[PDB]
């Protein structure tokens, strides 16, 4: 997980917002899967009681 | 402590994905505004999870927003008491010692 944080103040000052009262924080990542033998997985679909 | 009334309050912090988290800060993955701040509530349907999945490219800006909410509780204090009354002739002339 990659996290980026910019608290409001001088660093967030911009030509759009000269005062820079705003700020943000973000998170991002990658994910993938490779299945070698799908025949080994199993499943039984059914209803369930209340 | 004294001088603070008769009540106490605290804060509970609701998790991100609980249904109780309700707010207007949500922004959908497409960039359009959405009613729900949390990605999906306490929903275990595969359709909702599949539809509402965060997604970004290499340079990402303003895609998915979330929000948070807190709740508070209370307590209070009461008072009780009782008494009884007697006379000196009763204790002095009683046949039983140590009645008190």
């Amino acid at each position: 997980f990659t996290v980026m944080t910019k608290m409001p103040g001088k660093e967030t000052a911009d030509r759009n917002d000269p005062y820079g009262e705003t700020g943000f924080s973000s998170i991002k990542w990658y994910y993938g899967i490779l299945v070698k033998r799908p025949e080994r997985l199993a499943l039984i679909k059914t209803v369930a009681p209340l | 402590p004294k001088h603070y009334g008769k009540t106490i309050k605290v804060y509970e912090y609701v998790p991100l994905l609980d249904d109780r988290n309700i707010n207007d800060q949500g922004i959908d993955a497409s960039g359009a505004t959405i009613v729900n701040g949390n990605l999906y509530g306490s929903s275990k349907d595969i359709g909702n999870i599949t539809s509402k999945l965060p997604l970004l490219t290499e340079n990402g800006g303003r895609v998915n927003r979330v929000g948070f909410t807190r709740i508070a509780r209370e307590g209070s204090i009461h008072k009780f008491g009782f008494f009884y009354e007697f006379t000196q002739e009763s204790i002095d002339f009683d046949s039983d010692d140590g009645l008190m």
Binding site: - | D28, S30, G31, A32, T33, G47, R62
Partner: protein, 139 residues
Amino acid sequence: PVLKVMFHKDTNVATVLDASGSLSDGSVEVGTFHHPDETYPDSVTIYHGVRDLLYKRSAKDPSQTASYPNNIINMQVISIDMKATPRLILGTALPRVISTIEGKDVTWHVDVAGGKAPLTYKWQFKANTVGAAFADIDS
């Protein structure tokens, strides 16, 4: 599918609606764009298209056009409401290759989400022989 964009100056709202649709709230037309980009279907979403469309128009009057310093370049205040039909996506895809022996039943399943409501399905088949084209399977 081509989409059409309306902008309301007072509330700073950009509305994306289908081409035939119209709005009577008092907004003006900024432009049109393709929701699935013809060159890059998956790289660009609605937000980028709306931003590129609004870059051209002028800040003081949404109808007129202006250069960079007077553009509408701040999308923190701009909010997007989607009224067009959601895009069709293929959640489940058919297997690329199926192998079997003669006399065994074969089943194909496809799952599609989005679109309007009366989504229909039609299946087509081609033979291996040379000069063969897709033929409809008789329902």
